[PDB]
Amino acid sequence: RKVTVATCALNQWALDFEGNLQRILKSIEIAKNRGARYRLGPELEICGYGCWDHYYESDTLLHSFQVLAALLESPVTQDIICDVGMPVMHRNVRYNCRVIFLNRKILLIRPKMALANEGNYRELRWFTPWSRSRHTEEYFLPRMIQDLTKQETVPFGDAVLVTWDTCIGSEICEELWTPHSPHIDMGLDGVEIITNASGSHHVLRKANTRVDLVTMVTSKNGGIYLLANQKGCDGDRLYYDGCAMIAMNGSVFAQGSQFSLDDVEVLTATLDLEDVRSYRAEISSRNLAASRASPYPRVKVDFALSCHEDLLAPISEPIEWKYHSPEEEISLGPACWLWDFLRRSQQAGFLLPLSGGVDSAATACLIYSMCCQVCEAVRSGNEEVLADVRTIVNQISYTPQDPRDLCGRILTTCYMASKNSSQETCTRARELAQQIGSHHISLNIDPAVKAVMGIFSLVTGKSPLFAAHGGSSRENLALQNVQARIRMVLAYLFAQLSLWSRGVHGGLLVLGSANVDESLLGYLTKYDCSSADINPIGGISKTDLRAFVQFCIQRFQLPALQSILLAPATAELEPLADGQVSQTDEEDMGMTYAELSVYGKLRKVAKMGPYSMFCKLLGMWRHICTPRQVADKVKRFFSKYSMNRHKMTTLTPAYHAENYSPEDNRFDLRPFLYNTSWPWQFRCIENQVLQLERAE
Amino acid sequence: RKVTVATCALNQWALDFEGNLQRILKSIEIAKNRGARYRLGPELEICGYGCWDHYYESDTLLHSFQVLAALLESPVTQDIICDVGMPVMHRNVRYNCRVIFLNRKILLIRPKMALANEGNYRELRWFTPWSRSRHTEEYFLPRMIQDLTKQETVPFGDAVLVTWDTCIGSEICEELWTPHSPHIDMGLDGVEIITNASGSHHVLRKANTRVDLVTMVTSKNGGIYLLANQKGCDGDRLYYDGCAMIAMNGSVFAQGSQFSLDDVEVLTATLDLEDVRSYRAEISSRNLAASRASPYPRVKVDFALSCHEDLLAPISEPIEWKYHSPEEEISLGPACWLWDFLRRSQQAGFLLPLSGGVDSAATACLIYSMCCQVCEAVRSGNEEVLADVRTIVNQISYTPQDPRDLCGRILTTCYMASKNSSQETCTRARELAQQIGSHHISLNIDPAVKAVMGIFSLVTGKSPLFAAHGGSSRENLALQNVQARIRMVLAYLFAQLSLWSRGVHGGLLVLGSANVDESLLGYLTKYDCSSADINPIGGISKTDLRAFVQFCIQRFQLPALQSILLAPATAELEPLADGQVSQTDEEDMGMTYAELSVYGKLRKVAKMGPYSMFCKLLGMWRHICTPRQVADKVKRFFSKYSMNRHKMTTLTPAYHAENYSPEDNRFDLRPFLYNTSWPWQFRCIENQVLQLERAE
Numbered sequence A, B: 001r002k003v004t005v006a007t008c009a010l011n012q013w014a015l016d017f018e019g020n021l022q023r024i025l026k027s028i029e030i031a032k033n034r035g036a037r038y039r040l041g042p043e044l045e046i047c048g049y050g051c052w053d054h055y056y057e058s059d060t061l062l063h064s065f066q067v068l069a070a071l072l073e074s075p076v077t078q079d080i081i082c083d084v085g086m087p088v089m090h091r092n093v094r095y096n097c098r099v100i101f102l103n104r105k106i107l108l109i110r111p112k113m114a115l116a117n118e119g120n121y122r123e124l125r126w127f128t129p130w131s132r133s134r135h136t137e138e139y140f141l142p143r144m145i146q147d148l149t150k151q152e153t154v155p156f157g158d159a160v161l162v163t164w165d166t167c168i169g170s171e172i173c174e175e176l177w178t179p180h181s182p183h184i185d186m187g188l189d190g191v192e193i194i195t196n197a198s199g200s201h202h203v204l205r206k207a208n209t210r211v212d213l214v215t216m217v218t219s220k221n222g223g224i225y226l227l228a229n230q231k232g233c234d235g236d237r238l239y240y241d242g243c244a245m246i247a248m249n250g251s252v253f254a255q256g257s258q259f260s261l262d263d264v265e266v267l268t269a270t271l272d273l274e275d276v277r278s279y280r281a282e283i284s285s286r287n288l289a290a291s292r293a294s295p296y297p298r299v300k301v302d303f304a305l306s307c308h309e310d311l312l313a314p315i316s317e318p319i320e321w322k323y324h325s326p327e328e329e330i331s332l333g334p335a336c337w338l339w340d341f342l343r344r345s346q347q348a349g350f351l352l353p354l355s356g357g358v359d360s361a362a363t364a365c366l367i368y369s370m371c372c373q374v375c376e377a378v379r380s381g382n383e384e385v386l387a388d389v390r391t392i393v394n395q396i397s398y399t400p401q402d403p404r405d406l407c408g409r410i411l412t413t414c415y416m417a418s419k420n421s422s423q424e425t426c427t428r429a430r431e432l433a434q435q436i437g438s439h440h441i442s443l444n445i446d447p448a449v450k451a452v453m454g455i456f457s458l459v460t461g462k463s464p465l466f467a468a469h470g471g472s473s474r475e476n477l478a479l480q481n482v483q484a485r486i487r488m489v490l491a492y493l494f495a496q497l498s499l500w501s502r503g504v505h506g507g508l509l510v511l512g513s514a515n516v517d518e519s520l521l522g523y524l525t526k527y528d529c530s531s532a533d534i535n536p537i538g539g540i541s542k543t544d545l546r547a548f549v550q551f552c553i554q555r556f557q558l559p560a561l562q563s564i565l566l567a568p569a570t571a572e573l574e575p576l577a578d579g580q581v582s583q584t585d586e587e588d589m590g591m592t593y594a595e596l597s598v599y600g601k602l603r604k605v606a607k608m609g610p611y612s613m614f615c616k617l618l619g620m621w622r623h624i625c626t627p628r629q630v631a632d633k634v635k636r637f638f639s640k641y642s643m644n645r646h647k648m649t650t651l652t653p654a655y656h657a658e659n660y661s662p663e664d665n666r667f668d669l670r671p672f673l674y675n676t677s678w679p680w681q682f683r684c685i686e687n688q689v690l691q692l693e694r695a696e
Ligand SMILES: Nc1ncnc2c1ncn2[C@@H]1O[C@H](COP(=O)(O)OP(=O)(O)OC[C@H]2O[C@@H]([n+]3cccc(C(=O)O)c3)[C@H](O)[C@@H]2O)[C@@H](O)[C@H]1O
Pocket: A477, A480, A481, A484, A523, A524, A525, A526, A528, A571, A573, A588, A643, A646, A672, A673, A674
């Protein structure tokens, strides 16, 4: 009848065994206080999901087991079934596993059967899928575990648990949406509870597909579904957004946070198993298509999941899943990201080159949002967060209440004007900093620039001129770039010495402000301020950035943003001749951010090369453009793209948000020395155009 | 690139080969006029899905083939791929099949692999599932087909079509929601179009699950999905509600009618196949879990599904599916049902015993609704419907415009008052008839009743008395029943002779007015007016009936319904003693229609016997009732149920609406001679109660 189960989101850290252990323990202790008899944790939670090439290392395996032993001998784990994740090597093959134990015995080790090998995922690099479906083998335990557990071997493979009162089965992360998912046969076999341990990272706007899936599955097959997921940054450019859930028969009973500053969040629910049994009768109490397939092996477990609590235990009522707006998503994720980055880097704060333009502004807003979250958290009684703030600012007695106050201690904004900067942009940056609370620095680079160009003249005997002073296209560009790069040099100097100049220990993380759209076209200066330490908006669309900044006005009460939004998007690096005004980035690029986004998505999402893309747009923009015209747009896109790709190889690491990122380290593997005339492809395009231009 | 496909709903009639053929032809001719190159029809459309035990008959097989030949030699079928359904016997085994042909050749015969064996479905009685998955065998054609088609054999089995431009696959009705559905592997294999031929009957409120499924499937796997379904009554108590659809990548492009008076409704859509290809790339352009399964056999077809039309052919835009309210569902289905029943029975009209109570009223409303639909249809240019009305009323020149006018010619209502009927009920019936237009008859049964009881006295020397005149419980009941049955005798007399008495040829179908709730408890008199020819509200809940009638007030403008709703639900068959008023049916039954519905659903839907049901309610009604109390309610329910079940065996056939029907012929097979003390079960219940009553 009535059972009480727990799932959870943990902020795990790659190879951080000590912390990882304490987090797992805490969740189990929490679940037990709430009356749970089964606890589900995230995929590979013992070592942290993102260990990458450390999985090749045997030490990883070893410590994981030492962590497992600690769990097994811990008095908290008594009388609750615990499903943890670690790597495990069986017969010289490395598997991504679930280790399920109860009262100092291992019940079953259950290896993953479908591995993620797309986008940021590459599990086949380190793990093998279990291929012997509906079968188990005897796994031989480490003497370390034997001595403790008093078992020689345990079942290893595709099996389910049978207890005195129920039948629980495992579905690991992506097995949930893999063709022919375990949950189908488990359902058929009569499995009433299905646990899914995830490690899925944030992706702007796609939170609902996870929820929908679990929902549909429970709706279609009946049953309780448990989903646990990592939450936070585990040591790289991903943010895991654990929307841990508990679903039954198509309804949701517990909704876990997508972004929060909690290291441990536990969901429970009290459900009557008979609701499953009667909901399944409601559908098909009959037989099926006559399948006669090999049935699931069964691990007998001497334990009752439901135990006497009924007399008081309130049944969980169904709930509606509340989603975040896309702007709320943006204001929360990169924000919580930046918080883990700061706290785990053990760095003294951030250094933000603030230009008075939209992106640098958005970046500033993310920090302010971070501060708010921290204040919220501290108010909420979050000891970990309080501990951390106190450690970051060095003040034992400190207690952030006003976000502007915390911000000041944590953020240093820096406006670096050139000879041609307007008074307006300088002002806007000054105002925005004033409003969020940051320590603002305003300086002029021109003395350093004059000096560099002096060195050049001194040695070549030649003086480059700006385009407006009769300079060549090359000279103009070079000059612009020098200023860009001097800014970067200065940014790092302050990162390294500004706190020093204020009488205080420590150094700052440099933050970048490239957006995903310009990153793709390479419309940036190699090694200017586009290269920093971390970039939180690197993966966000320009349009979304504007959207996010306009949303910040009212949510954070920052009026300084209006002028910033209204101002013309221009880079004041070159003097303006009489009769003309500044050129906008969109004219500079030779395409609007809108249409740039389309190329982006057609390229990475829809997997189109130039010919394919030419054909798509030809129809999409059939009214607006002519065949010759789209050819030119596409050609212009691919050439600029290819010419600039090398800029991508060295680009600052970015929070992952859009599934159309051009990021080269993990998500978008590509050449960087292309033939930039695309002779063959472009010829195909021409032929098509010529063919169409034969119509009357 | 761009293709144009058609699916359809047909009003097929069991064994009605001539008509069935003409309907299939018409749809194909319509699809071709709309530019379709593939046409999909419903499950077993050649013979009509509901042939039942006629499937055992070889003639069925034979004529189906003669119908197939007619299709093959027909000039309309040229240059369109046609997917029809018939039974087919291969190697002495009978399969439910799809026959796909193009230009006088059979491409592939594709047999069903999961058979429906639940509720009203019992396909295993006549058909065998195809068990050799991903395999085909040579089917040897009838000489009849050979001579015509010039082929010795064709592929028979699990295969897909490959054309010059696309890949089309088959999913038959329930295979869509069977574990491990064809659409998963077909998707994996690269099948871009999937056709599903259905024969699913109406079920109140469950229309969305069909739509959701197709939607989710296309969303999850990408692709175009086509669904065709029978629409109307094919010769029995089911109404097929063809919500034929066309879906792609998660959106709907065409929505077919659930209830209409069309014999043929064709949906088309013009879709670009490249949208599929680019939507699938969007998800997983990679590889999967490494499955290495036997792949689908491929029938090469020398045909291009897309042919030059692009230059003009508008792409279909996505649409939102519009559902009917439950009351709209009720006002339309049974209505369209009654229309096919009337027209195919070749009967002159209906005869409705109208009591001045809610159910008889609802029944009247269904007829009025029918008339409206017919008027609507005729206005809409529907020749078939016009032809039929003209044939039913015998007037060549007739053209229904006013629904009250048609109603008058088609409906005869009959109020049969006893000695104890009130003037109020008589009035209400008179008024409702006036308002809908029916020929109303009002009479008094008492002369016939006196006469029967005279015969009894004359021969036994004894005079039974009503309870209020000192009569025994048995006498009272008997007397009541006699009146009930005399009403039935009279109803059939008018059915058979009322038109005659009005100078006009023909006879009437007697309509019944039992609701699903009282049918279950047996709260009716065996062979009273509860037994008629057909009952359209036999499967509808009392609460829904009240809901439907209140909705009719404003939709049909019938004020007479208000008093009918407001009036006390009492059966005026026995005289009332001084000091007391009439007893309501709900007190008579010893439970409210509400709680009766719960028993109904817990019983048939949730598959609970008395013990199970006692346990469910014990929790459901934990605040409201005590354990001893629910025991009594349940016990009272099962006993009355069991005592009365025999009434079910002979009960009038009813439109199917609720999936908790107690109908004995098809949907709810049960004993009818029970041990009505349920000694064992009831003892278990007592033990549980006694156990609980030991708590303080
Ligand atoms: N295939 C290849 N593989 C490896 N390296 C390759 C290469 N092709 C060129 N390179 C080299 O890469 C280097 C590129 O760097 P660099 O020479 O500095 O020049 P680069 O970064 O290519 O040009 C900077 C761009 O930034 C734009 N800009 C201007 C002003 C302000 C802003 C702003 O928004 O902040 C942007 C400006 O319009 C210009 O197109 C060159 O030395 C070039 O020789």
